[PDB]
Amino acid sequence: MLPRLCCLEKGPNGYGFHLHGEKGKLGQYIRLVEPGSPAEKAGLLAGDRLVEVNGENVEKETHQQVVSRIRAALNAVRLLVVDPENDSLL
Ligand SMILES: [Cl-]
Ligand SMILES: [Cl-]
Ligand SMILES: [Cl-]
Ligand SMILES: [Cl-]
């Protein structure tokens, strides 16, 4: 069964979430999803690992590269995410 795909339209304060790396591990993860934000409305959850941004694999890209892809020059983003406790990359 398909990973969650969160489709967000940019709001007045952006999407409403933080993205961060974790020492000792690869990847970028969701944190601090703001109440009432497009992020919350789309079902993004703190702790989710970000796998794709707008159809492009960011599984192991750097923090800067992933942030740049989310910010792009677009006003909408599609985030493919997984729960790392339930999903592993092989
Ligand atoms: Cl703020
Ligand atoms: Cl958090
Ligand atoms: Cl959350
Ligand atoms: Cl999952």
PDB file of C-alpha atoms and ligand atoms in Angstrom:
ATOM      1  CA  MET A   1       0.000   0.000   0.000  1.00  0.00           C
ATOM      2  CA  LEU A   2       1.113   3.490  -1.085  1.00  0.00           C
ATOM      3  CA  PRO A   3       3.104   5.848   1.083  1.00  0.00           C
ATOM      4  CA  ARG A   4       1.273   8.940   2.148  1.00  0.00           C
ATOM      5  CA  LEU A   5       1.411  11.755  -0.375  1.00  0.00           C
ATOM      6  CA  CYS A   6       0.816  15.180   1.125  1.00  0.00           C
ATOM      7  CA  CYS A   7      -0.149  17.822  -1.385  1.00  0.00           C
ATOM      8  CA  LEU A   8       0.251  21.315   0.003  1.00  0.00           C
ATOM      9  CA  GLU A   9      -0.636  24.728  -1.358  1.00  0.00           C
ATOM     10  CA  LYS A  10       1.565  27.454   0.004  1.00  0.00           C
ATOM     11  CA  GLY A  11      -0.172  29.701   2.499  1.00  0.00           C
ATOM     12  CA  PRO A  12       0.607  33.179   3.827  1.00  0.00           C
ATOM     13  CA  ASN A  13       3.187  31.736   6.298  1.00  0.00           C
ATOM     14  CA  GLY A  14       4.451  29.061   3.954  1.00  0.00           C
ATOM     15  CA  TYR A  15       3.685  25.382   4.388  1.00  0.00           C
ATOM     16  CA  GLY A  16       3.877  25.220   8.214  1.00  0.00           C
ATOM     17  CA  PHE A  17       6.548  22.639   9.073  1.00  0.00           C
ATOM     18  CA  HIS A  18      10.221  22.262   9.832  1.00  0.00           C
ATOM     19  CA  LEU A  19      12.601  19.882   8.111  1.00  0.00           C
ATOM     20  CA  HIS A  20      15.680  18.536   9.849  1.00  0.00           C
ATOM     21  CA  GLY A  21      18.465  15.987   9.647  1.00  0.00           C
ATOM     22  CA  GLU A  22      19.413  13.523  12.363  1.00  0.00           C
ATOM     23  CA  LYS A  23      23.032  12.771  13.293  1.00  0.00           C
ATOM     24  CA  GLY A  24      24.022   9.128  12.908  1.00  0.00           C
ATOM     25  CA  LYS A  25      21.451   8.687  10.156  1.00  0.00           C
ATOM     26  CA  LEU A  26      20.678   9.629   6.614  1.00  0.00           C
ATOM     27  CA  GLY A  27      17.643  11.561   5.558  1.00  0.00           C
ATOM     28  CA  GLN A  28      15.439  14.511   6.300  1.00  0.00           C
ATOM     29  CA  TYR A  29      12.495  14.406   8.677  1.00  0.00           C
ATOM     30  CA  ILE A  30       9.353  16.382   9.416  1.00  0.00           C
ATOM     31  CA  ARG A  31       9.093  18.335  12.687  1.00  0.00           C
ATOM     32  CA  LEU A  32       6.743  20.959  14.265  1.00  0.00           C
ATOM     33  CA  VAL A  33       3.722  20.871  12.000  1.00  0.00           C
ATOM     34  CA  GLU A  34       1.797  24.027  12.760  1.00  0.00           C
ATOM     35  CA  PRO A  35      -1.902  23.796  13.628  1.00  0.00           C
ATOM     36  CA  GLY A  36      -4.154  25.055  10.861  1.00  0.00           C
ATOM     37  CA  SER A  37      -1.355  25.006   8.269  1.00  0.00           C
ATOM     38  CA  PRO A  38      -1.440  23.431   4.820  1.00  0.00           C
ATOM     39  CA  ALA A  39       0.969  20.860   6.289  1.00  0.00           C
ATOM     40  CA  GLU A  40      -1.452  19.865   9.009  1.00  0.00           C
ATOM     41  CA  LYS A  41      -4.406  19.876   6.592  1.00  0.00           C
ATOM     42  CA  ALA A  42      -2.484  17.536   4.250  1.00  0.00           C
ATOM     43  CA  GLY A  43      -1.735  14.984   6.975  1.00  0.00           C
ATOM     44  CA  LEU A  44       2.007  15.622   7.441  1.00  0.00           C
ATOM     45  CA  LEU A  45       3.212  14.320  10.764  1.00  0.00           C
ATOM     46  CA  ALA A  46       6.231  15.027  12.955  1.00  0.00           C
ATOM     47  CA  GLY A  47       8.734  12.195  12.632  1.00  0.00           C
ATOM     48  CA  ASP A  48       7.879  11.343   9.014  1.00  0.00           C
ATOM     49  CA  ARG A  49      10.854  10.799   6.738  1.00  0.00           C
ATOM     50  CA  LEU A  50      10.689  12.761   3.479  1.00  0.00           C
ATOM     51  CA  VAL A  51      11.200  10.482   0.477  1.00  0.00           C
ATOM     52  CA  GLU A  52      10.248  12.627  -2.523  1.00  0.00           C
ATOM     53  CA  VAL A  53       9.567  16.259  -3.275  1.00  0.00           C
ATOM     54  CA  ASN A  54       7.539  16.878  -6.398  1.00  0.00           C
ATOM     55  CA  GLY A  55       8.318  13.466  -7.814  1.00  0.00           C
ATOM     56  CA  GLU A  56      12.059  13.565  -7.193  1.00  0.00           C
ATOM     57  CA  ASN A  57      13.952  11.281  -4.842  1.00  0.00           C
ATOM     58  CA  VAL A  58      15.386  13.117  -1.838  1.00  0.00           C
ATOM     59  CA  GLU A  59      15.852  10.021   0.324  1.00  0.00           C
ATOM     60  CA  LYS A  60      19.520  10.801   0.938  1.00  0.00           C
ATOM     61  CA  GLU A  61      20.025  14.290  -0.431  1.00  0.00           C
ATOM     62  CA  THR A  62      21.536  16.966   1.789  1.00  0.00           C
ATOM     63  CA  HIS A  63      19.542  19.248   4.026  1.00  0.00           C
ATOM     64  CA  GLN A  64      20.265  22.189   1.704  1.00  0.00           C
ATOM     65  CA  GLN A  65      19.303  20.337  -1.462  1.00  0.00           C
ATOM     66  CA  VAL A  66      15.954  19.161  -0.007  1.00  0.00           C
ATOM     67  CA  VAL A  67      15.046  22.603   1.383  1.00  0.00           C
ATOM     68  CA  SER A  68      15.853  24.130  -1.999  1.00  0.00           C
ATOM     69  CA  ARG A  69      13.569  21.622  -3.747  1.00  0.00           C
ATOM     70  CA  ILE A  70      10.667  22.385  -1.368  1.00  0.00           C
ATOM     71  CA  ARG A  71      11.162  26.135  -1.745  1.00  0.00           C
ATOM     72  CA  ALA A  72      11.885  25.755  -5.559  1.00  0.00           C
ATOM     73  CA  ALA A  73      10.289  28.615  -7.390  1.00  0.00           C
ATOM     74  CA  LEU A  74       6.824  27.045  -6.943  1.00  0.00           C
ATOM     75  CA  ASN A  75       3.848  27.847  -4.701  1.00  0.00           C
ATOM     76  CA  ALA A  76       2.734  24.169  -4.168  1.00  0.00           C
ATOM     77  CA  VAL A  77       4.536  20.978  -3.153  1.00  0.00           C
ATOM     78  CA  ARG A  78       3.858  17.248  -3.135  1.00  0.00           C
ATOM     79  CA  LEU A  79       5.639  15.439  -0.322  1.00  0.00           C
ATOM     80  CA  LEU A  80       5.911  11.666  -0.327  1.00  0.00           C
ATOM     81  CA  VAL A  81       6.545  10.531   3.243  1.00  0.00           C
ATOM     82  CA  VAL A  82       6.913   7.386   5.312  1.00  0.00           C
ATOM     83  CA  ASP A  83       6.948   6.451   8.963  1.00  0.00           C
ATOM     84  CA  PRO A  84      10.532   5.299   9.608  1.00  0.00           C
ATOM     85  CA  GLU A  85       9.323   2.897  12.297  1.00  0.00           C
ATOM     86  CA  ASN A  86       7.239   1.133   9.622  1.00  0.00           C
ATOM     87  CA  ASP A  87       9.338   1.625   6.518  1.00  0.00           C
ATOM     88  CA  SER A  88      12.991   0.963   5.746  1.00  0.00           C
ATOM     89  CA  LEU A  89      15.110   1.493   2.660  1.00  0.00           C
ATOM     90  CA  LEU A  90      17.037  -1.576   1.384  1.00  0.00           C
TER      91      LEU A  90
HETATM   92 CL    CL B   1       6.240  31.645  12.093  1.00  0.00          CL
HETATM   93 CL    CL B   2       8.534  17.772  16.486  1.00  0.00          CL
HETATM   94 CL    CL B   3       2.514  15.981  14.022  1.00  0.00          CL
HETATM   95 CL    CL B   4       4.855   4.108   6.139  1.00  0.00          CL
END
